[PDB]
RNA sequence: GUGCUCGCUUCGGCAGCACAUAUACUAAAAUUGGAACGAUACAGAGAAGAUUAGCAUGGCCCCUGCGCAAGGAUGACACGCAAAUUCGUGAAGCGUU
């Protein structure tokens, strides 16, 4: 039933209170995963996945660093069991990147010129506010 | 948006400085047009008397095949062929009478 777990050992003792939100988010990700490809779009059908991923990982980032309500061993375990995302967290550590939409939208190779996608640009630089949903994430102005 | 100014300065905002910087055939679309070796239906097989094995040449003809192999009715099509030429036409120049 759960994210059937490879480590075979006991999850530490702070795991049962992060359990319910984690699971419900997981069943949620399964529903957003199954939501089937109607006249929806093709480029826009992966956006919910990056929502829920960012959400999972922002949750565990709260329950470690912002509240200090989890042991670091349980933390690395929740990294290893796919509930968290190592590289999202590792960027979120940086200065300008608090609200990173996903890890790709800063991958410069995915664009022709080797620059980040406009998702990264602050809203002040535009000053015109034409609504932009970044192709990769679907995000609207992460930072 | 995060943070720091022994910032105005309370815990509000505002300020300032630091960091963070530019995706995209933008379309779920909308047109636009050839073909399917499918019926149909016609049509209907090289060489000399007859029945027939092929291997080629040629070129805006292709198909199956990894193929520089092999096959496809000898894969098909090649089917007027022109031409100079035996003697004259005339035309125009250069010299002779
Ligand atoms: Mg042959
Ligand atoms: Mg032939
Ligand atoms: Zn963004
Ligand atoms: Zn983006
Ligand atoms: Zn994004």
Q: How far apart are CA A135 and CA A100, in angstroms?
A: 14
From the CA of A40, how many Å to the C1' of B34? 32
* List of protein residues whose beta carbon is under 7 A from strand B: A 39-43, 94-99, 108, 110-113, 115-118, 120-122, 124-126, 132, 134-136, 143
The reported resolution of this PDB entry, expressed in Å, is 3.0
Residue with tokens 């957003």: A32
CA of A100 to the centre of ligand 1 (A): 66
SS3 A106: helix
Q: Which residues span the domain enclosing A88?
A: 1-143
Query: Which method was used?
Result: cryo-EM
Reference A106, options A95, A98, A115; nearest CA is: A115
> How many structural domains is chain A composed of?
1
Whether the Cβ atoms of residue A48 and residue A133 lie closer than 8 Å to each other:
no
């Amino acid at each position: 039933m759960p994210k059937v777990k490879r480590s075979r050992k006991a999850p530490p003792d702070g795991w049962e209170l992060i359990e319910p939100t984690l699971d419900e988010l997981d069943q949620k990700m399964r529903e957003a995963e199954t939501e089937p490809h109607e006249g929806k779009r093709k480029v826009e059908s992966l956006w919910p996945i990056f929502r829920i991923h960012h959400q999972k990982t922002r949750y565990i980032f709260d329950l470690f660093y912002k509240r200090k309500a989890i042991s670091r061993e349980l933390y690395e375990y929740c990294i290893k069991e796919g509930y968290a995302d190592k590289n999202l967290i590792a960027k979120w550590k940086k200065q300008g990147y608090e609200n990173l939409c996903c890890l790709r939208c800063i991958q410069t190779r995915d664009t022709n010129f080797g620059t980040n996608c406009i998702c990264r640009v602050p809203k002040s630089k535009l000053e015109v506010g034409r609504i932009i949903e970044c192709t990769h994430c679907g995000c609207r102005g992460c930072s």
